[PDB]
Amino acid sequence: TEFSEEQKKALDLAFYFDRRLTEEWRRYLSQRLGLNEEQIERWFRRKEQQIMVSKGEELFTGVVPILVELDGDVNGHKFSVSGEGEGDATYGKLTLKLICTTGKLPVPWPTLVTTLLQCFARYPDHMKQHDFFKSAMPEGYVQERTIFFKDDGNYKTRAEVKFEGDTLVNRIELKGIDFKEDGNILGHKLEYNYNSHNVYITADKQKNGIKANFKIRHNIEDGGVQLADHYQQNTPIGDGPVLLPDNHYLSYQSKLSKDPNEKRDHMVLLEFVTAAGIT
């Protein structure tokens, strides 16, 4: 967060001691092992990577229960969504049942799909070192988006994705502004279905995290597509090393359904998510 003039002077000083301490160990190692500091650092870099990969595989083995909570405000219309389900990263698979707890959802369920868990992606064996999402766990990450609906309003979202005990939790605040009251969103003119998309991921070294860009196409009732341009940033909540990825993408396919025995406004969501783009 924010730093005083004193802390700035103290942290600036402490930085040099931090580097000095490490330097003394590397220097000693180089003398004992007969390796230069480049070699030692390169070994440590790969060992750290292996450790992060193993830690993420351990945390996400088998089926992980999920809780989702969203508080939203779109054009002053307030609503809340609560969801539960389970993720199975081994199979790149996530299932959720999400309920509007405040009555009728004032936007279409499909517009909330991206907002309502990239840590359940299946990364192929040769790409596991590029999985930022699992590497930030269990402390988790903050996921922020702006979503621009073409010729309409925008959502801004801030979510925290992290383990709370045994459960992976996605807690979101959403604010939407400048929507037409008769547009495709507030007018509920979007089909209850979902296309498959690629989410393009790049490293954001400065923030120790990632950024993503992608365009969602929502099918419109009676024909046409409503574009939703997504800009995404993810930042670790903890300090620990994370995996900063090479450019790659996540391939998403989704299925929306309804529980015939659920009276409340709701969405059942199944997503398959697979990393790709590295040969």
Add this chain to the structure above:
Amino acid sequence: TEFSEEQKKALDLAFYFDRRLTEEWRRYLSQRLGLNEEQIERWFRRKEQQIMVSKGEELFTGVVPILVELDGDVNGHKFSVSGEGEGDATYGKLTLKLICTTGKLPVPWPTLVTTLLQCFARYPDHMKQHDFFKSAMPEGYVQERTIFFKDDGNYKTRAEVKFEGDTLVNRIELKGIDFKEDGNILGHKLEYNYNSHNVYITADKQKNGIKANFKIRHNIEDGGVQLADHYQQNTPIGDGPVLLPDNHYLSYQSKLSKDPNEKRDHMVLLEFVTAAGIT
């Protein structure tokens, strides 16, 4: 380089002590300053970045003399090139006079332009944290390429770019294979000129370096363009932190000329190089 079974066991053990030592300092700091470890790491990360930026600006201030040396072998034809000049990174500018010391150059000078100093790029103020090349100095970096000439042979190059005392030196070995003896390269059918190109740079976190991809278009005598597809990797020679960049590109413009008073086969090369692609 290579590691024994013993060193592997020793390095694996030493890794944990390295992390323990750092952890003890961060823990103490958090207690003394009232900041969490994420906050301390984030401060240190930015301080390290500022330091690397300042160090690179210091090393490349004003005009830096340059030495270039290439030993080449294309289809068994052996040749050597020696060059000197100067770089002025403040102005994103490099000038070289390069001479074939072994007689007649057996390939066209334009095909060697990319092989014969990305550290002289001008990075705009808002992009200086993405300059890997200066950050690897003075220890330097290894630059490796494979260059595929369309419908002809390929070059493979390994260069070391580093300071040797006050001078920035580029020392290269080049091997070319599978060229047609009557093709555009060995047949000397390329114009003595050079188009402007963009060099697309991405981080290679695993190797603590960068990769680049770009396509050179060499104008052919009597018309047409000869494509040279470049794949590039740069790896630090030292251990010290380097700046791993967001995706961006280097914009190149080049001018080839001749010294009217030079009897040996030669090329005078002027390049302007500017980083871009970040808004």
